[PDB]
Design a protein around this ligand. Sequence first.
Ligand SMILES: Nc1nc2c(ncn2[C@@H]2O[C@H](COP(=O)(O)OP(=O)(O)OP(=O)(O)O)[C@@H](O)[C@H]2O)c(=O)[nH]1
Ligand SMILES: Nc1nc2c(ncn2[C@@H]2O[C@H](COP(=O)(O)OP(=O)(O)O)[C@@H](O)[C@H]2O)c(=O)[nH]1
Lengths: 434, 426
Amino acid sequence: MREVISIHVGQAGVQIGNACWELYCLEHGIQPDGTMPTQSTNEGESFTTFFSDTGSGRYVPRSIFVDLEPTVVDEIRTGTYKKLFHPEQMITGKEDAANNYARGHYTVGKELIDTVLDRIRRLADNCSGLQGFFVFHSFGGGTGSGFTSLLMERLSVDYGKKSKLEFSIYPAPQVSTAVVEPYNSILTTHTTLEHSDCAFMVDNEAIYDICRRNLDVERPSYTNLNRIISQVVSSITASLRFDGALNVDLNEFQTNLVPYPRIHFPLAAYTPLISAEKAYHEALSVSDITNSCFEPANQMVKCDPRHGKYMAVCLLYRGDVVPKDVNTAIAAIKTKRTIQFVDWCPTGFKVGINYQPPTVVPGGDLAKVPRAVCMLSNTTAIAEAWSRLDYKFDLMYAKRAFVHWYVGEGMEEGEFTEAREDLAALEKDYEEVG
Amino acid sequence: MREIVHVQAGQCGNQIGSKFWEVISDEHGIQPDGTFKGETDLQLERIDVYYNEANNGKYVPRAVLVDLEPGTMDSVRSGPFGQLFRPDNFVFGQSGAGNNWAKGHYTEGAELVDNVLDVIRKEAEGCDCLQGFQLTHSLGGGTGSGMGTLLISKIREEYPDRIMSSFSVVPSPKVSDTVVEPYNATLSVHQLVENTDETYCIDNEALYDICYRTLKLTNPTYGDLNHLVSLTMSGVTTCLRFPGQLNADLRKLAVNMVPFPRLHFFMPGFAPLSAKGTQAYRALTVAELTQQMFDAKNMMAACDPRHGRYLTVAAMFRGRMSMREVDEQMLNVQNKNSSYFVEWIPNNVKTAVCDIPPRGLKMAATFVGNSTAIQELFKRISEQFTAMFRRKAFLHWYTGEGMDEMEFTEAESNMNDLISEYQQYQ
Ligand SMILES: Nc1nc2c(ncn2[C@@H]2O[C@H](COP(=O)(O)OP(=O)(O)OP(=O)(O)O)[C@@H](O)[C@H]2O)c(=O)[nH]1
Ligand SMILES: Nc1nc2c(ncn2[C@@H]2O[C@H](COP(=O)(O)OP(=O)(O)O)[C@@H](O)[C@H]2O)c(=O)[nH]1
């Protein structure tokens, strides 16, 4: 049937995948050792998109772990989730690229790219309904940028027509770690425009704002930030892993949300995202959280949504939701005038309601709420998020700082110049279409 | 896998590691016999990076011990952790440099360089892919500043690819330690700006000012001054030896910091630092450990941090910490101290967090900074170097060895171009 493959490249690929595949074992009733208990067969209704069958219910994830460094991969090969994954699906590196492009685009990647594309083809030949790709990466990583652009340069030659999905983290304009992240974000945007269907972005700080105010988590780290992103990942798959009245597959997401083949970069949002106590004193209706979707304390990228112009807003609901107030509240959004559209698209809405409510992680900070919304809103606030990063790249480039690492690794300096004219017209097209 | 040798040369760097290997021994649960006694295998899963296990678990440190005399050999050998080192590596001469560069470089060091060159080759043949070298020596004396100077000029012939850590002490403005101390500085840095990747300019003077105020210790033992050098170096390589939420190898520490192929002269910092009785009376918060890192007190060199600009801030934090409070305050220092940074380089903070603190604390911070007030370190020595060349004193200890007069002036021109490059962006 339909079967979807996931690829995890970089350390952000490692631990986000350590949460998403951890979460899916809860939502299908699969024990982490590798087999299933017999009670979760009725829950296991069309789980075939990720898990091959082996011998007696033993379910390997159709997932590939790619890293140039063996350290964080051994965390998978130490914990409980060691026996779940397949060993020859784990392909490790030895020498690190250290957030450098040609160290991750030519040096260690080209010794390992031929090993992993076989493991792509070894697994994908079982498919008769191969839909899409979950590729997880960063923007400033050596293998996060240098290998990811090269990997998407090769799978479009192989499979082409079949879809792709990229999840990543938007680098914050104020608080971020690596100094080469303004460099590599221009590099990972250069040749991945042509080789990616859609790519999503989240902020470190925009997670933190709801963590401190609504979750009331005043000591967050990369443990709980992986759980919050994984709920957004799981809510997309709920249209596919279960039987809904009006649901949507991966080819349909890009068909609605891509108005032009270059501007295809929306973001995410999730609500209700609060702690376990505040849901007790409040009855969260449909009109409650849907109006909570379109306020700037709910976006997952810290920018100005009111200074952006909405073009195609996508909505996926979960839980037992009636469509009457849905057909009212989205109309009640249209009664408000602050939600600005473009003049040519009034019909940029998507309706999706699944029967299954989201189930929370065990021992987590969330609360069991029936209603939830995964808001996807492509807008022109991405252009205002382009200018904050195009300011960082050029001024460090003008003094030619940190160029002496990019030179000797098999890389040219004129490629920095061509990406400048490439990204200049990109943020222009938000204002040209808008 | 990723493998690093540690080489000591000269009387300074030979006794720095002698306390430094002890902490590396104690952070991984081994013995002077090399017997692993770590309870959790977290102390074993990256034991291979500094060790070569052979014949029932007696781990030998990947260490080379070089001297021009047998004086410093037996003291390390009969001293603490003397049974741990491999006796194959005990290569030495019978001269002594006598604080003379051309003896350590041309005359006597040219004899003993061939023996350990194969020893550099031998342990590098038994590995899959080397990673980089770390070197402890001196810049004031004659043995390490003359012999370890020439060693870097032959590593690049073997391995022109990897990184070179050259940790060495530097002169102080207050009291000179040796007589030819400005001669041992300009002639060494002439070769250090050619083929090295990082130097940590640690002043001997300011280490007492750390101990006199924080530690309040009236009796500075030389085991204790290198002990503060020991905990600095172990915090740098914590990513290669321990897991965490964000790992950062020595090359990532290299590539984030050095902007131009000369300006790689960094000073280190460490927090917390205090005496015994002030433990409970202060706070172990992210905010208290933040502002200690950016004080003139924590400056291990005797240069003034408000007389320069931080270019690349490296925050190697150790311990179970909240990431957002790290994300909070590293923003807050630039909202306070925007004059204290270089202006045209945005987001000057680089953060690497391992979730394992060092032994003896609960939360620590390993700082390495790039102030452009380290320009004054090469301002003060270029005058003392040109204080005695104007009278041509001590020339019969160098030209009598066969040193060129142009060898002074070629180094003297490249010394003065170095402070022009800090001036370029200040
Ligand atoms: N929040 C979060 N961000 C991560 C995590 N892992 C990596 N990142 C992001 O990844 C960016 C840089 O990429 P890295 O993961 O460090 O490097 P890489 O992708 O493994 O590529 P290499 O340099 O070749 O090792 C950083 O700016 C981080 O923000 C993670 O576990 N949690
Ligand atoms: N902190 C510290 N510094 C030392 C020690 N021994 C030597 N030094 C420094 O090393 C410098 C002298 O160099 P040295 O190696 O002893 O002379 P050499 O053997 O001829 O090369 C002096 O400036 C000392 O400050 C020590 O045990 N601790």
